[PDB]
Write a protein that binds this ligand. Structure first.
Ligand SMILES: *[C@H](C)[C@H]1/C(=C/c2[nH]c(/C=C3N=C(/C=C4\NC(=O)C(CC)=C4C)C(C)=C\3CCC(=O)O)c(CCC(=O)O)c2C)NC(=O)[C@@H]1C
Ligand SMILES: *[C@H](C)[C@H]1/C(=C/c2[nH]c(/C=C3N=C(/C=C4\NC(=O)C(CC)=C4C)C(C)=C\3CCC(=O)O)c(CCC(=O)O)c2C)NC(=O)[C@@H]1C
Ligand SMILES: *[C@H](C)[C@H]1/C(=C/c2[nH]c(/C=C3N=C(/C=C4\NC(=O)C(CC)=C4C)C(C)=C\3CCC(=O)O)c(CCC(=O)O)c2C)NC(=O)[C@@H]1C
Ligand SMILES: *[C@H](C)[C@H]1/C(=C/c2[nH]c(/C=C3N=C(/C=C4\NC(=O)C(CC)=C4C)C(C)=C\3CCC(=O)O)c(CCC(=O)O)c2C)NC(=O)[C@@H]1C
Ligand SMILES: *[C@H](C)[C@H]1/C(=C/c2[nH]c(/C=C3N=C(/C=C4\NC(=O)C(CC)=C4C)C(C)=C\3CCC(=O)O)c(CCC(=O)O)c2C)NC(=O)[C@@H]1C
Ligand SMILES: *[C@H](C)[C@H]1/C(=C/c2[nH]c(/C=C3N=C(/C=C4\NC(=O)C(CC)=C4C)C(C)=C\3CCC(=O)O)c(CCC(=O)O)c2C)NC(=O)[C@@H]1C
Ligand SMILES: *[C@H](C)[C@H]1/C(=C/c2[nH]c(/C=C3N=C(/C=C4\NC(=O)C(CC)=C4C)C(C)=C\3CCC(=O)O)c(CCC(=O)O)c2C)NC(=O)[C@@H]1C
Ligand SMILES: *[C@H](C)[C@H]1/C(=C/c2[nH]c(/C=C3N=C(/C=C4\NC(=O)C(CC)=C4C)C(C)=C\3CCC(=O)O)c(CCC(=O)O)c2C)NC(=O)[C@@H]1C
Ligand SMILES: *[C@H](C)[C@H]1/C(=C/c2[nH]c(/C=C3N=C(/C=C4\NC(=O)C(CC)=C4C)C(C)=C\3CCC(=O)O)c(CCC(=O)O)c2C)NC(=O)[C@@H]1C
Lengths: 161, 26, 159, 191, 66, 161, 160, 160, 161, 161, 160
């Protein structure tokens, strides 16, 4: 994976360049954002269970998916779905701290689409659930944090679709 | 013995009755 | 503690402590005096924190302290308060350690099993900890309060 | 020009933790290693076993240091949850691929390796095949008795680095273990 | 099923390892009976010595329930 | 393992006591020492190879052990001995940071005597090597650090013997 | 970086970031501004640091700059200085990252094997890095120098 | 099913089916006709069983059907009844299969996790199943009721 | 796998329907057949080696395949072929008890053709061997059993081809 | 392990004797008892959680053990104790079905005392808990069943002490 | 036995005995009285069964009782009969147990290896067991004979 700080460093290392003021400005930008991100991450971790419940209520449950024949029908499948939701939330939080989406590409997004297609998990509904989590998270974290949080959720959704 | 809890708990029960409030969704 | 965690990672990788690991130890030991102060404040106000949080909890959940409810009766009510006191003590330990290792071993691992046997409702123990946070946070300075808050939130998360 | 994360990359190293259980170790330290066993051998991606998956008597013997991590891993494979999730849905050649992945950390090295294990499965148990890999010399060199198995992408034999990337990074499990209540294709969108 | 309790000490004579190998070197453990013959051989080929063997579970000379 | 901070906490938890001023004073004592310990640890890590070389020169090499028929004879055995020396140094450093000897008991000391007896490794010589390392370390770390460092080396030596 | 390391530990535990781990991140972001200044100082003085450190190293070990030695000859001497410059660049990256992860991936993994093929003596290389630390320390403020020292020491530890 | 379980164990052992396993299959096929009748009885009386069980549950636990409770509101109360109906359907499938395997995969694995997200109390759910058993037993013949009881008991045990 | 009984259950569960009389009739049909199947299975298990021998004599041996240059030339390949025959027999017996072809699809049939093509195993000859086994089995089991037994053998043959 | 039927066969096989009338009488005795045992086992399984709760209330909880400084203090230790209680109950039920105490010796009893002594688990309290479970079980199972149930509980208690 | 097998499966699953597993135990205990009678009949007729089966086997395989053959000579012929008696005793134990587990430990594991050392042909031994079944079947009632047949068949399957 890569984080914001390392991403700058890596770009300079391929050039072979020592760090310069322009590079330092990007690093400085991250350092101001950082405090906000830490606070946001703690909020999400404490309210994680609630976030998933609310998001499921908004998109997944009370639907044909939960009703017989649906992918989220049966307790085993319901539990699997909320398990996946929790994974996505945890990785989004990691990405937000890191300030880079790379981690999402590596662990979360690798082979996911193909696996989902074979399983018969509906991608569109999953995307919907990610978007629902984002909205819920946005409220909890507060507006400044929400903008940062949103991009990582959006990154996941675009990958899946 | 939880003696401090025993006296404080009864003090709390005497000062206020919970058996009427009813749960509030809030 | 912070120390234990750092050392354990190093030992597993069979290496001396990284500059990063050393830095975290330095930061932690600087914060030590402040952390001890936060713990002392909460220790002193323990009886108040438990009791006021208890009252809020009984208001929030009348049912538990009702003839039908599990917590009903003075002995039962005392036990619920005793539990709150235990959890408060744990929080203070966490703050001075700078991590949850102490908290986790003593109070969260196996917690699901124990309360379920007792039939005490956990979807409410968490609320009691939230309550305790609110009271405790009001006795602390803003910076101190935030530090203390994290540990309270961890407990709520763990349940 | 190429960057530090170009070939093998930085990630797969450092995502690998050797875990050894120590008798003295705190319960919180021990339980992180136990959870790692469950997550390598049963493919618990979330990394925290659901209680029904756990095996408690074995966990107690492990926490007591009456058995080794190696012997715990052997018990897991002889377990019924192993057989239902990994033996029963798959075909024998895929069963072998999953064995090497689950214990050993790698894709099967060769068709000759596949054939030996398939002949074990057919003539003797699933358990006899589980016993063979753990008893195998490869197993004993990389992990011995103390180390919990890890994902290792070898590269020593030819073709194994590719294969082991495909089995650890892209072959997420794609079949349902349970036969009952098959999901209908439609109902994709939620209305 | 029968089980053996076994103590052994094993040296690394082919290579020198930096990571802590004490748990591998001296290992009291419980072994299923059907596994022990293989596990004994393994310790002997390594040039380990088998310090002790006791049958933890099971009865000696039992025709059934074994 | 256990550290000084956790050791106080554990003692109070078995009593069930909330943390008190006397307890706080012990914790405070550790916190003052801590900065010094971190500096000492960095010194040891940088000079680790040298420390082992000097200690071996003082006790192990140019001796009967290195000469044929000695335990440290053959390259394989020489290498194993300096590997063990490195272990002792690394764990003593860990203990010094922790401020607790527990880790030494849990990892280094446990089973060592029995293993050594089966191997035929001579304990007395090993102890001698540990004592030699201590003296070398003492010089590098400086006096204030040395006192703290010494107790952990002594703890190892007593355990082995 | 500090961030990368924290995330990796959490992933292994399969947990959200702990309060203690979050605190470590907070401390790093606060320190960042100071760290950037330290790195800038070293970047400016780089040419001088490399040159002075080279001289000290050659004084410490005549052999490397001798017919037997690897450094002998102009081209070879330049290459040895180039290597010192590479290590200095890595150290600056390390200081801003707050961890040696950047340093370690670029410079410390496989270093033994690389140098052994070249036949360069590793202990001499370590001496050159020690030399660089001494020069760097003089330019830096005492507090700054201590911070910088750790990263320099790590390099010396990693290859010796 | 009985059949499935027997075959699966044999496949893992890589053996043909044991004499004892064959005997158990024979017993199951003999019992099958009886089992089908028991299932039919419960299916016919389903609406009544659910309703009676519901009443008992609500009487035993006021809270679920209260503003605080999950069941509160008509929609919620309907869902609680729907759940009871689902569990009854599962039990009937179990009786004809002769095993809880059908029941277990559809309803008991992951049940805790599902209910915990919903925040429904699991012990209440168990009570509802117990209630359903009492009603069901009355409709069934004594011998039939014993058979049916086991399957009901399994559910109650699992939801704990 | 899924047995006959579970197959009925599955069909009703996706509909969400409780079991009905028509469904019950299918279940009833299986229960009458069941006793016959158990008897047949025991016959096959006792005569398994003989069945394979006779089938090999009918198709595989005394042929070009066994002679040098053939896929069943060499002891290693001969033994592999008789091992495959045994597997087919065992799985067909399992399917016959189950009253469902699913187990054959899940374990035997899945990826078999592709494996055979890479190996160079001749499918046609294999199919011939399965058909030969069927005839031998038919005799042993007796007519009522034979009809049931035949469909599973036929299912294997069709899958392979 | 060994059950009543196998135990008889075990004894006759060492003698080399064919099954005799006296042996048959022991087997006959078991077969009459069997129906009662099956009923008792189902009762215990359904009420298992309650049995453990009642027994803990009777002996373990509201005691010094649960209070700080006691072996059942901390959630971890409390949970371990109720887990052990569950084990004892489950194995006693298995023994009662089997009609043999061997299984208790093979799985529960062997090494338990020594383990408990190293842990510092108090044996006397454990025994007390087993006896409490027996009383609770006795009520549920009914008198005829209770006599059979009692011996296995007593066997556990004697083993521990 | 049936009991042992059921408990062992439960212990592996770490669960109390399933309703289906309990039902199988119930059926077996009902069958038990009949099983004991079947065993008694075979025990009484054992001497006759062994003798008749021996004759048929020697008729089926003249070779075994020929100078080359293992059975040749009085002592050898006695041993072959002794073996048949052992297998009959095992079958009786199996009938009362309702499972071959007892039989399997004493007679079927290592059988190939034992016979290979002796150089006795295993297929001939199987024929002798088949012979024993035919004699035994005639003495038994048709329903009883079917039950007994399964156990005889298992033996034949196990060594083949
Ligand atoms: C929830 C919003 C939706 C949903 C989820 C769902 N997932 C599965 C099954 C699997 N989920 C995964 C996913 C992952 N495995 C990984 O390794 C990673 C990335 C590292 C992910 C995110 C996997 C592989 C499985 C298969 C095996 C398993 O459960 O571990 C199911 C169950 C499918 C089944 O038939 O069992 C479900 C329901 N499905 C929905 O309907 C929601 C829209
Ligand atoms: C209060 C939040 C809830 C409540 C209280 C309540 N608690 C108990 C009993 C026990 N509490 C403990 C728990 C602990 N022991 C420990 O070691 C720790 C960790 C430090 C804890 C948290 C114990 C052991 C008990 C059991 C009995 C005993 O204390 O010896 C009870 C009594 C249980 C009962 O069923 O009678 C009660 C009622 N009840 C509520 O509803 C509140 C939500
Ligand atoms: C050197 C002449 C050129 C070079 C080589 C290079 N290779 C890698 C990485 C890998 N090399 C292999 C290759 C093999 N594995 C095998 O089994 C065989 C056959 C015996 C070969 C030849 C593998 C699998 C890897 C990846 C895994 C590993 O590192 O072990 C790299 C590095 C990529 C990285 O990110 O580390 C390089 C540099 N490249 C050059 O520049 C030379 C032209
Ligand atoms: C409860 C009545 C009493 C009690 C119990 C208690 N036990 C432990 C720890 C262990 N318990 C066992 C025992 C078993 N493990 C098994 O597999 C079996 C057989 C099926 C038994 C009975 C073991 C091995 C352990 C040690 C390791 C482990 O945790 O698994 C403890 C915990 C001690 C600790 O701190 O770990 C306790 C509390 N003690 C009481 O207070 C009651 C009297
Ligand atoms: C000569 C070709 C090079 C050289 C050699 C050198 N060796 C030492 C010191 C030691 N050498 C050994 C080596 C061995 N011990 C063994 O068991 C074996 C295998 C059978 C060998 C090869 C040992 C153990 C020592 C340590 C002293 C001792 O033996 O007690 C030195 C001395 C240097 C010092 O002590 O620091 C030297 C000079 N040195 C060169 O540069 C030559 C190229
Ligand atoms: C050096 C001062 C003395 C010396 C050492 C020596 N040790 C071995 C072999 C082993 N040493 C250990 C010790 C440890 N392994 C651990 O995990 C720990 C705790 C972290 C320790 C301290 C072990 C386990 C071995 C065996 C396998 C291994 O290499 O690790 C030898 C080799 C003996 C042999 O024949 O194998 C030697 C020589 N011996 C001396 O003479 C010095 C005084
Ligand atoms: C009634 C005894 C208790 C109760 C029930 C209750 N359930 C819900 C909501 C849902 N329940 C389910 C459950 C299942 N889905 C399955 O596939 C299975 C197994 C076949 C079950 C049992 C589901 C999926 C839902 C979610 C909504 C949906 O159906 O899509 C509620 C409503 C809670 C909410 O907020 O939605 C309730 C009330 N609650 C109690 O307290 C009773 C004790
Ligand atoms: C002679 C020493 C013994 C003997 C011989 C015998 N063999 C067969 C049949 C076959 N023999 C083979 C063997 C091989 N195929 C190979 O690839 C190799 C290695 C190069 C060998 C040794 C095969 C394949 C057959 C099958 C028939 C065929 O050739 O296609 C028989 C006939 C078997 C039957 O029962 O009909 C016989 C008699 N048998 C003895 O009695 C001698 C001790
Ligand atoms: C015999 C009628 C024909 C024959 C067979 C043959 N098969 C192989 C190799 C394989 N056979 C399989 C098939 C299975 N393995 C299983 O476990 C199952 C399901 C239970 C089946 C049906 C597989 C997977 C292999 C590959 C690995 C292995 O050997 O186990 C061979 C060997 C060919 C080779 O060169 O490896 C042969 C000979 N071939 C014939 O000639 C007959 C027509």
């Amino acid at each position: 994976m890569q984080d914001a700080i390392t991403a700058v460093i890596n770009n300079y290392d391929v050039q072979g360049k020592y760090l310069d003021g322009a590079a330092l400005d990007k690093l400085k930008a991250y350092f101001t954002t950082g405090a906000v991100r830490v606070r946001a991450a703690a909020v999400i971790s404490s309210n994680a269970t609630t976030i998933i419940k609310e998001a499921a209520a908004k998109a997944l449950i009370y639907s044909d998916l939960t009703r017989p024949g649906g992918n989220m029908y049966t307790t085993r499948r319901y539990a699997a779905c909320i398990r996946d939701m929790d994974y996505f939330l945890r990785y989004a939080t990691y990405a937000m701290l890191a300030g880079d989406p790379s981690i999402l590409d590596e662990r979360v997004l690798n082979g996911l689409k193909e696996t989902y297609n074979s399983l018969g998990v509906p991608i569109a509904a999953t995307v919907g659930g990610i978007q629902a989590m984002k909205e819920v998270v946005g409220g909890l974290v507060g507006p400044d944090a929400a903008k940062e949080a949103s991009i990582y959720f959006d990154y996941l959704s675009s990958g899946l679709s | 013995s939880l003696g401090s809890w025993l006296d404080a708990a009864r003090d709390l029960i005497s000062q206020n009755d919970y058996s009427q409030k009813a749960i509030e969704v809030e | 503690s912070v120390l234990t965690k750092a050392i354990v990672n190093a030992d597993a990788e069979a290496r001396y402590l990284s500059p990063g690991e050393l830095d975290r130890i330095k930061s932690f030991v600087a914060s030590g005096e402040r952390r001890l102060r936060i713990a002392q404040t909460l220790t002193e106000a323990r009886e108040r924190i438990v009791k006021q949080a208890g009252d809020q909890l009984f208001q929030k959940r009348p049912d538990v302290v009702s003839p039908g409810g599990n917590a009903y009766g003075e002995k039962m009510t005392a036990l619920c308060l005793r539990d709150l006191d235990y959890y408060l003590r744990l929080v203070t330990y966490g703050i001075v350690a700078g991590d949850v290792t102490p908290i986790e071993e003593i109070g969260i691992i196996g917690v699901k099993e124990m309360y379920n046997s007792l039939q005490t409702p956990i979807p409410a123990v968490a609320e009691g900890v939230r309550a305790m946070k609110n009271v405790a946070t009001s006795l602390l300075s803003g910076d101190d309060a935030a530090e203390a808050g994290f540990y309270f939130d961890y407990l709520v998360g763990a349940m | 020009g190429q960057s530090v994360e170009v070939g093998v990359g930085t990630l797969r190293r450092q995502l690998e933790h050797i875990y050894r259980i120590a008798p003295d170790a705190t319960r919180s330290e021990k339980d992180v290693a136990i959870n790692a066993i469950y997550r390598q051998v049963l493919d618990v991606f979330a990394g925290i076993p659901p209680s029904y998956l756990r095996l408690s008597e074995a966990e107690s013997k492990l926490k007591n240091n009456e058995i080794s991590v190696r012997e715990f891993v052997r018990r897991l494979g002889r377990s019924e949850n192993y057989r239902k999730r990994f033996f029963e849905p798959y075909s024998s050649p895929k069963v072998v691929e999953l064995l090497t992945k689950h214990f050993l950390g790698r894709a099967p090295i060769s068709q000759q390796e596949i054939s030996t294990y398939v002949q074990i499965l057919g003539t003797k148990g699933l358990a006899a095949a589980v016993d063979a890999i753990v008893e195998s010399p490869e197993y004993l060199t990389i992990f011995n008795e103390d180390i919990v198995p890890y994902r290792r992408y070898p590269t020593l034999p030819a073709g194994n680095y590719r294969a082991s990337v495909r089995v650890n990074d892209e072959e997420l499990i794609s079949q349902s273990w349970s036969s009952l209540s098959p999901t209908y294709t439609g109902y994709q969108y939620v209305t | 099923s029968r089980y053996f309790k076994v103590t052994a000490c094993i040296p690394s004579l082919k290579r020198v390892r930096t990571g802590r190998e004490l748990q591998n070197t001296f290992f009291t453990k419980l072994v299923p009976y059907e596994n022990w013959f293989t596990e004994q051989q393994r310790i002997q080929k390594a040039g380990g010595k088998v310090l002790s063997v006791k049958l933890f579970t099971g009865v000696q000379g039992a025709n059934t329930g074994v």
